[PDB]
Ligand binder design. Structure first.
Ligand SMILES: Nc1ncnc2c1nc(Cl)n2[C@@H]1O[C@H](CO)[C@@H](O)[C@H]1O
Length: 385
């Protein structure tokens, strides 16, 4: 029953996703708000602790006590230059407890501090409860994914987050490996298969090259930009609309925190529409000083606004190919991961770089990692019996 059941969890920097393999098919489980992905956010309020959508929905009102980006801290020392550099950009406090970072917040009127694994465990507990609500029984066996570049300390702290959350961690697998499993790229029989995973998420960009030799996975190269993602594209739309508001009304809105955040969420929504329509409309009632902001933008203008950013995704692709010592024609499969890979210009740039090649994109790119993890979790629990 429950002992023969296992889930696959994609524990992402900005969003997390949970899947289950049953009756010959993967089911990506929707949360209680009907969303197939859940924000990796934890909010501490005057009455409760919020996780996911509810935590992300109140981030503007409570920024000092809304934790996100815990994956950037997990398994790292406080003195690490990655931690010291990131801390300057977070509205929550990060403290040092014996060279280990802790996030310090106000919770039910009291000062509390949490290890990154305790924060990630709260996200994992939510994914576990989402699966239990869908299945009708508690599931405890899980496969949890991590970036291919995570070291042993980051992998161990992710497994610890799993244990704190009440999960039996069957295996910690690499995100590009879970994505290649999702597409059945390890079941093509004999001979070495070279796979390139292009992973463009909300806040990070990762390029991974894998070799699959008789079901055995080998990471040949990892490249990317840890500070490039979908949120940089939302911000480019924000700056455009701030300048358009200034041209139409001779008013600078940039300082009004509420106006900028309402514009940001509307920009993110319009950006998603631009992946399937050639235009998107913004409808913001009373944006600033009682002025409605009802406008539109073409996909052509959006592509111009992010042009340099989209083109920058090809430098880590080239860097990964040289590190792996492979030419373009030596890559057998191209896999898309991350919600931002739905952007048509991004797909066109990657397809043209690979000389007109077909892309593996039939599985929702923001779900492909949880999908593969769910497949692996089913194989692993069956072998355990
Ligand atoms: N349809 C879409 N067109 C463009 N960007 C998208 C789309 N869906 C998501 Cl999710 N994202 C973005 O992907 C990230 C999460 O993986 C977020 O930045 C989200 O906006």
């Amino acid at each position: 029953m429950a002992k023969a059941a296992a889930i696959g969890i994609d524990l992402g920097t900005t969003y997390s996703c949970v899947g289950v393999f049953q009756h010959g098919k993967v089911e990506i489980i929707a949360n209680d708000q009907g969303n197939r992905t859940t924000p990796s956010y934890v909010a501490f309020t005057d009455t409760e602790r919020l996780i996911g959508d509810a935590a992300k929905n109140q981030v503007a009102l409570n920024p000092q006590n809304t934790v996100f980006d815990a994956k950037r801290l997990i398994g790292r020392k406080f003195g690490d230059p990655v931690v010291q550099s990131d801390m300057k950009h977070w509205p929550f406090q990060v403290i040092n407890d014996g060279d280990k970072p802790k996030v310090q917040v106000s919770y039910k009127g009291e000062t509390k501090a949490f290890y990154p694994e305790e924060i990630s465990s709260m996200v994992l507990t939510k994914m576990k409860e989402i699966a239990e609500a869908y299945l009708g029984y508690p599931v405890t066996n899980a496969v949890i994914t991590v970036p291919a570049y995570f070291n042993d300390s980051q992998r161990q702290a992710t497994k610890d987050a799993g244990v704190i959350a009440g999960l039996n961690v069957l295996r910690i697998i690499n995100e590009p490996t879970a994505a290649a499993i999702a597409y059945g790229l390890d079941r093509t029989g004999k001979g070495e298969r070279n796979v390139l995973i292009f992973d463009l998420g909300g806040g990070t960009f990762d390029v991974s090259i894998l070799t699959i030799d008789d079901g055995i996975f080998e990471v040949k190269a990892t490249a990317g930009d840890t500070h490039l993602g979908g949120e940089d594209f939302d911000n480019r739309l924000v700056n455009h609309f701030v300048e358009e508001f200034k041209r139409k009304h001779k008013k600078d809105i940039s300082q009004n925190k509420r106006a900028v955040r309402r514009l940001r969420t509307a920009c993110e929504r319009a950006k998603r529409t631009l992946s399937s329509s050639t235009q998107a409309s913004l409808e913001i009632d009373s944006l600033f000083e009682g002025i409605d902001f009802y406008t539109s933008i073409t996909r052509a203008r959006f592509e111009e606004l992010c042009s340099d950013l989209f083109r920058s995704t090809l430098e880590p692709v080239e860097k990964a190919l040289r590190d792996a010592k492979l030419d373009k024609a030596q890559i057998h499969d191209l896999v898309l991961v991350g919600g931002s890979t739905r952007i048509p210009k991004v797909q066109k740039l990657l397809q043209d770089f690979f000389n007109g090649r077909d892309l593996n994109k039939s599985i929702n790119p923001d779900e492909a990692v949880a999908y593969g993890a769910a497949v692996q979790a089913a194989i692993l629990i069956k072998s355990t019996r």
